[PDB]
Design a protein around this motif. Sequence first.
Motif, mmCIF file in Angstrom:
data_model
loop_
_atom_site.group_PDB
_atom_site.id
_atom_site.type_symbol
_atom_site.label_atom_id
_atom_site.label_comp_id
_atom_site.label_asym_id
_atom_site.label_seq_id
_atom_site.Cartn_x
_atom_site.Cartn_y
_atom_site.Cartn_z
ATOM 1 N N UNK A 1 40.995 6.060 -13.349
ATOM 2 C CA UNK A 1 41.110 4.731 -14.049
ATOM 3 C C UNK A 1 41.783 3.971 -13.177
ATOM 4 N N UNK A 2 42.749 4.194 -12.355
ATOM 5 C CA UNK A 2 43.488 3.221 -11.600
ATOM 6 C C UNK A 2 42.792 2.492 -10.499
ATOM 7 N N UNK A 3 43.095 1.553 -10.271
ATOM 8 C CA UNK A 3 42.278 0.592 -9.397
ATOM 9 C C UNK A 3 42.503 0.949 -7.926
ATOM 10 N N UNK A 4 41.477 0.848 -7.132
ATOM 11 C CA UNK A 4 41.501 1.168 -5.711
ATOM 12 C C UNK A 4 40.715 0.092 -5.106
ATOM 13 N N UNK A 5 40.823 0.269 -3.916
ATOM 14 C CA UNK A 5 40.160 -0.765 -2.916
ATOM 15 C C UNK A 5 39.052 0.192 -2.115
#
Length: 33
Positions: free
Chosen positions: A5-9
């Motif tokens: 759920x943590x944002x990544x690129x």
Amino acid sequence: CLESGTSCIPGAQHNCCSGVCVPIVTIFYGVCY
């Protein structure tokens, strides 16, 4: 590591715990699986 759920690129350094970055907006922005 970036947790679920943590944002990544996607395509960049996606330090996700699973390593899997799921593209949400586009392949330019996503979240860790």
